[PDB]
Amino acid sequence: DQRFGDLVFRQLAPNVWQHTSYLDMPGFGAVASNGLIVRDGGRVLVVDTAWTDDQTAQILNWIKQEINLPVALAVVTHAHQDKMGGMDALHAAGIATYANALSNQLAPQEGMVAAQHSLTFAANGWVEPATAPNFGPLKVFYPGPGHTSDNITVGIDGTDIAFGGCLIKDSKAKSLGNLGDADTEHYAASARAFGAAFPKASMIVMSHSAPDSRAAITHTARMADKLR
Numbered sequence: 001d002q003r004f005g006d007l008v009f010r011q012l013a014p015n016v017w018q019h020t021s022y023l024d025m026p027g028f029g030a031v032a033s034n035g036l037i038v039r040d041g042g043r044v045l046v047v048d049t050a051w052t053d054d055q056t057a058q059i060l061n062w063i064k065q066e067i068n069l070p071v072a073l074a075v076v077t078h079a080h081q082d083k084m085g086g087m088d089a090l091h092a093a094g095i096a097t098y099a100n101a102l103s104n105q106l107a108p109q110e111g112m113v114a115a116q117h118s119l120t121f122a123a124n125g126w127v128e129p130a131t132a133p134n135f136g137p138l139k140v141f142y143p144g145p146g147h148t149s150d151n152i153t154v155g156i157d158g159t160d161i162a163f164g165g166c167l168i169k170d171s172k173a174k175s176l177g178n179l180g181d182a183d184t185e186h187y188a189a190s191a192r193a194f195g196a197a198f199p200k201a202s203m204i205v206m207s208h209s210a211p212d213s214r215a216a217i218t219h220t221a222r223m224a225d226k227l228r
C-alpha cells in the first residue's frame with residue numbers, strides 16, 4: 001500500500017491500481033471506498049471518483065506523480081457519493097466522464113453532478129459500444145438492478161480483474177450493507193450475472209472490501225438469496 005495524503009493506492013497488475021478514499025459517515029466510522037486506475041498505452045483510464053472533489057484531485061495528483069500520462073476518461077459505477085462525489089474535480093481537470101444514463105438521471109437528486117456522457121446497455125447487459133468510445137480494455141456491463149437500480153460493472157481486458165463496485169462484497173462479508181436503494185428481488189441474479197459476464201476473472205475488485213477471489217461473487221449472491 002502507498003499512502004498518499006489521506007488516500008491509499010495499491011498496484012494490482014502491471015497496468016492496474018486500486019484507489020482508496022475514506023469518508024467519516026457519522027454513525028458508521030470512516031468508510032473506505034475503492035476504485036481503479038488503468039494505464040492503456042499512453043493514457044490513463046479511471047473507474048469511480050473518490051468520495052469528494054478534493055480526494056479526487058489527489059487521485060489525479062498521484063496519477064501525475066506515478067504514471068505521468070494524460071487521463072483520457074473516467075467511468076463511474078452508480079449515483080452514490082463514493083462513486084460520483086468527485087465529478088467536479090474530473091471536469092475541472094478536463095477529463096471526459098461517463099456513467100450509466102440512469103446514473104446521470106439520478107445524479108442531481110442524489111446530490112451528485114452528472115457525468116458528461118451517458119452509457120446505454122443492450123438487453124443482455126453489455127454496453128452499447130457507440131456510447132463508450134475509446135474505452136480500450138474497459139468492458140462495461142450492466143448486470144441488472146441490485147445494490148442500486150443503476151449499478152454497473154467493469155472488466156479489464158488483458159488482466160484477470162473484474163470490478164463489481166458496490167454490488168459485490170468479499171467472501172467473508174457479514175452483510176450486503178445498506179440496501180436503502182437496493183432491488184432486493186433481483187440482487188442475487190444481478191450478482192450472478194456479473195460473474196457470468198466475466199467468467200475468467202480471478203481477481204474481483206469491489207468498493208467496500210479488499211480484492212478477493214470469485215468466492216466474493218458466490219458469497220454475495222448467496223447472501224442476496226436471503227433477501228427474497
Ligand SMILES: C[C@H](CS)C(=O)N1CCC[C@H]1C(=O)O
Pocket residue numbers: 028031080081082166176177178179208
Ligand atoms: C454510502 C455508501 C454508498 S454505496 C454505502 O451505502 N455504504 C458504504 C459502506 C457500506 C454501505 C453502508 O453504509 O451500509
Ligand SMILES: [Zn+2]
Pocket residue numbers: 078080147148166
Ligand atoms: Zn452505492
Ligand SMILES: [Zn+2]
Pocket residue numbers: 033080082083166207208
Ligand atoms: Zn459504495
